[PDB]
C-alpha cells in the first residue's frame, strides 16, 4: 500500500509519456525490485494510470562519487555491508523508466495514452495486486460512454508471467478468452520449432469444440500430431481430449494406413474407440474415377523444363466426351490395366462388339491382341490410342489404387463439412497427409477448390462455419493465385476461418500479415522476423527485445485484434490441465 | 576464491544486461587480468549468473589527471615504481564491461538473460573453475521442472580456448557432440580457404559413418580432397580413415581417370585397397540416352547475350514425342554419328 | 549431400539445390554446405539452418549477415573479423544451445586414435 | 444499430433512387421486407446480376482469358487468339459456330430457337 | 597466362578467361592480370585472387571495392587515395600474410645485377 519509489522526472518521448523512478537505499535493502516488462499502477491527481517498466540504469544521486567510494573500500578491504554503513547509503540508488500505457475508465473502457503530463510532485507508483491485474486484463476498447456488452462464456488460456524470473509468475492472474475470436477469423502462430506450438494449437481446438459444437474443422495433418499425439510422449491428442470431454461421433479420420491407426486407437482409447473416431480410406478405385487418374498424371513432377505431353493434354480435356463412346473407353481401361492397376473381379468392357473380362488373365490377353488387329491402319490414331500405347505414365498410381472402393473421399468430405443434411452439429475432419505420398499436394489443392466454390453458393443462405488448420503455411500462402491465399483473403465473407502456423513471419506476404487478427508469438532469433512483426503490428515493439534474447519454452505473447489494449505475455496452459478444468 | 574486482555500474543495453567493474592497483600488480570473451561467474542476491567479458578501457578515477602526472613523471626521469609509489597507485586502475548471458537452474536448465537488474553494492565477479566450466558447457534449454533426457553416445569435438593467448586454453573442458545433430538437418561451414574447413568436414563425415552405418553420403568433390590425402598435407582422406576404422565395402568412387586413381589407391592403402574403395566409370552412352546429349547442347556457355537456337529448343522440348516416330530418331542418330560418336556394333535404325 | 562453394548453387531460388535446402527435412535428406561468402546465401537458408561452424572471415558483410541470421552470434563478430587463427572455430548447434562456443577442434588423427581404442 | 443507406433514405423520404444488383435476389428481398416493411419496393429495386453468354461471347472469352493462372502465368495461345480476334470472327458465321459449340459443350443452356450457320 | 587490360575479358561470366580464372587452379594454370580499375573486375574473381600488388588509385569506388574484397587494405586506403608516388606499391600475399606491406620495388636492372652474382 506504499509507493515503490519516488518520481523525479517526466516527459513525452515521441507518442508516449514517460517518467523516471528512483529506488532509495532503504528500499533496496528490504528487497524491493522492479522487473522489466512489469505492469505498475501510477496515481496522479486522483486518476489511476497503467504503467510498464522499460529500462533500468545506475546514476549518481547528489554530490557523490560512486566509483571512487566503491574502489577505495575494495582497496582497504573494508566490508561495506558490515563495517561502513554510511558509505553504503550514499551510492545505493537505482533508476527506472516507466511508460504510461493508458487508463481504465467507466466500466472497463480503455483510454489509450494521455494528453495530461503529471508533475513530479503529484505522481506516485504502486505495485499492482492480483485483483487489479485481473480487471486490467479484462479491459477493452469500445466507443465511448457505452455499456459493456457481456455475453458468451470465457475460458482460461494462460496466466501472466514475466519470463523465468523468480516471483514474476502469477498463476491466479489468468487471461480468459472467448472462443468467438477464432471463428471466422485468421490466426497466426509464430515461433521456433519445439517451443510449444502444438500444445497451444490443441488447446485452441479443444476450446472451440467444447464452446461451439456446431463449427466444423478441416485439419491438414502434416506432422501427424493431432489425432493421437501421445507419440511416446505424455501430451494427449484431440481424440483423447474428446474422450475425456465425452464428445462422441464428431471425428472423421481419413488415412491410407487404416490398420496401423486402428491398432493405435484401440490401445489408447480402449475397446469402445469406435464411438469417438471414424476411420475412412484415402485410396480410390481409378477404374471408377478415370478422371482422377488423368489429372494426377497431367500434373506430375515434370523434371525442370515443364513438358506436358500432347496426348495427356488431349485426354485431360476430352475424357468426359469419351465416356459416351464404349469403343474409346476400352483404350482408357486398357491403359490402366497395362500399367499394372489391379481391377476388381468381374469387370467387363465392350471393345468392338464382344464383351471381354479384364480381371481374367486369359480374356485380358485376347483383348490385348484384338487391340493390335484394329491398330493396323489409320483408324483413329491419337487420342485414346495414344494413352494405350504410352500407358507407362500411370505406373505411379499403383500406390493410390484400391480395387472395388467407389468412395470418392473428396465428395465425402464436402458433404461432411457443407452438406445439406449435415447441417450444423459440427464435424472435425483430420486428414493423414503423409499416407498420401506424393499425391498429397494434388488432393489438398483440389479439395480446397471444391470447398471454396460450395461456400460461395451458400452465400445469402447460410455460412460455411468451419476452420482450416494449416501447417508450414509459408509453402502455400506465398502465391497470390493459390487457393489457400484466396481463402486467407476472401474467406471472412463466407464464414471460413484459418489457423496457420509457420516458423518465420518474414516468409508470409505483408498483405496477408496485415489482415490476420490473432497473433500468438514465441521465441524468434532472426532480426528480419522481428522487424516484419513490428512493421505489421505496432504494439509488438515493446516486446521485440525479449523475443530475440529469451528462448523460453511455453512462453508466448498474445494479441487479438482490434480492441486489445496491449500485448500480454502468457504462460500457455497445458492441455492436461485444460481437460481437468473443463471436467467441472 | 575472491572477487576479481569491484562492480561500479550496471545498466541494460538493448536486450542484454551489462555491468562495469574496475580493477584496482593492488590486483594489477599481482597479475590478475581478464581476457576478452572469457566466461565469468556473477553473484548477486544469492543467485549465480554467467557473464562474458566484452570490452575494456582506461578511465580516470576520482579527481586525477593521469596524462599530466605520467608526462611530468617521465619528463623529470622519475621511477614511479620505486620513487613515487603514491602517484603510481593513484592512476593504476582499469575498467571492464561484462554482459549477463543467463542462469543455470535445477539440473542443468538454462534461463536466458534476466529481467532483474542487480544493484552495484551486491554484485560480485569470480573466475570460473574447470569443473564449473564443464558443468556450464553441458547446460541446455528445457521447459521446466523436468529431468535430463540423456540417450545416445557422444564424441568429443574440441576443447574450449580463448584465442592464442597464453592461459586461455582449457584442454580438460571438452565439448561432446551427438552425431544425430548432423542427420536430416542442415550444416553450414564458413571461413576462408586454409583455416580448417576440410578437417572439420572429414571429422564430421567420419563420425557419421561410424555412428550411423545406415545413412549414405553424396559428396560433390570439386577439389579432390575427401578420398585421399592432399599433396603437402598428411591429413588422411575418407578412404584411409575407413581403412583405419575397419569399415569395408562402403565407398564407391566415380571418376574418368580410373587408372591414375587406382595407382594412387594402391600406393596409399596397399594391395588390399579393393576391399574399401570401388572405382567406377563416369561415361554415358549417348545412343541410348539422346536426351542427355540434347540437354548438354542446350545449356552450353552462350557467351555475352545468350543465343539459344530455335532448333535446339524444339528438340529439347519435343524429343520425347520424336522418340515415337522412326524418321526423327533416324535424323538424331545420324547427327550423333556425324558428330563423331562411334556407336556399338550392330546398331540398326528404321 | 556434401556441397562445396555453395554460393554458386544456392543463389538461384528456382534451382534444385535451393529446393533441396528448403524441403529436404521432410524426405530425410540432409545437407552440409561450405562457403567463404556467407553474404551471398539467401537469408531464408541462413535463418533456417540448424548447425553453425564459423571460422575467420575477411569481410564485414559476411559477419554482419551472420549476426543477422542468429542473435547469439552478436558477441563474436570482432573476434572473427580480426583474428585469422587456423583450426579455431565457433560452434552453435540448434535449438537448445545457450550461446556460441569457441573451440580448438580436434584433428582427424586424434579422432581416429580415440575411436580405434 | 447503425442504419444502412436504404433505411436512411426511407427515414428521409427519398423514393425510387436505389437500384440494388445481386445474385441472391430472394434472400435480399426477404431481408428488405423484414427491415423496411411492406413498402420496401418504393425505395429499393432488386435486379439480377447475370449475363447471357450466347449473346455476349466477348465477356466469356475475357473471363476465360484473364483467369487465376496459379504460380507463374501460363496463358494458352488459343485463348489469346480468341481474345484478340473474336471481333473479326464475328463476321464469319462458320467460325462463330465453333465458339457457340464450345459454349454449348461447356454446359451453358441456350435460349429456345437459337440457330447457327 | 599474362593478361593486360583484364577488365575486357573478365566481364562476361561465360567467357573463356573467366573460366580460366575461376577453375584454372585445379589443372595447374596460373594467371597474372593487370588492370587500372579494380571496380571493373567482378567480386567473384576478386575474392578468388590470392596476390595483390596495389599502386596509386584516385577513385573512391576502386578503393571501396578493394577494401570490401580484402579487409587488411582498410589501413592504407587514405595513403592510396592521397599519394601518387611512382614505384610505391602495397603488397599482400594470401592466405598467411599478417598485414599489407608497403614496398619500393626493385628495378629490373638491380635484380639482374643481384642475380648475376
XYZ file of N, CA, C and O in Angstrom, chain A residues 313 317, chain D residues 61 65 75-84 89:
60
model
N -2.648 -34.081 -72.645
C -3.480 -32.883 -72.698
C -4.787 -33.146 -73.437
O -5.845 -32.651 -73.032
N -8.616 -33.032 -71.394
C -9.715 -32.134 -71.723
C -10.926 -32.851 -72.304
O -12.050 -32.354 -72.168
N -15.069 -14.889 -73.345
C -13.667 -15.019 -73.732
C -12.772 -14.237 -72.778
O -11.698 -14.707 -72.388
N -9.911 -15.845 -70.428
C -8.531 -15.466 -70.717
C -7.813 -14.947 -69.476
O -6.643 -15.273 -69.249
N -0.578 -18.330 -70.065
C -1.739 -18.065 -70.918
C -1.679 -18.887 -72.192
O -0.702 -18.806 -72.952
N -2.702 -19.696 -72.458
C -2.689 -20.526 -73.667
C -2.806 -19.687 -74.930
O -3.351 -18.581 -74.925
N -2.279 -20.237 -76.027
C -2.229 -19.495 -77.283
C -3.614 -19.323 -77.895
O -3.936 -18.249 -78.417
N -4.442 -20.369 -77.854
C -5.764 -20.284 -78.468
C -6.644 -19.265 -77.754
O -7.414 -18.542 -78.399
N -6.550 -19.197 -76.424
C -7.325 -18.207 -75.685
C -6.916 -16.792 -76.067
O -7.772 -15.920 -76.241
N -5.611 -16.545 -76.206
C -5.143 -15.230 -76.637
C -5.618 -14.908 -78.049
O -6.041 -13.777 -78.332
N -5.551 -15.890 -78.952
C -6.007 -15.668 -80.319
C -7.486 -15.312 -80.353
O -7.894 -14.392 -81.071
N -8.306 -16.028 -79.582
C -9.721 -15.681 -79.498
C -9.914 -14.296 -78.895
O -10.691 -13.488 -79.415
N -9.182 -13.991 -77.821
C -9.331 -12.712 -77.136
C -8.977 -11.543 -78.043
O -9.514 -10.443 -77.873
N -8.081 -11.756 -79.004
C -7.678 -10.684 -79.903
C -8.377 -10.712 -81.259
O -8.299 -9.719 -81.989
N -13.813 -12.673 -85.972
C -14.542 -13.924 -86.166
C -16.048 -13.702 -86.213
O -16.774 -14.505 -86.809
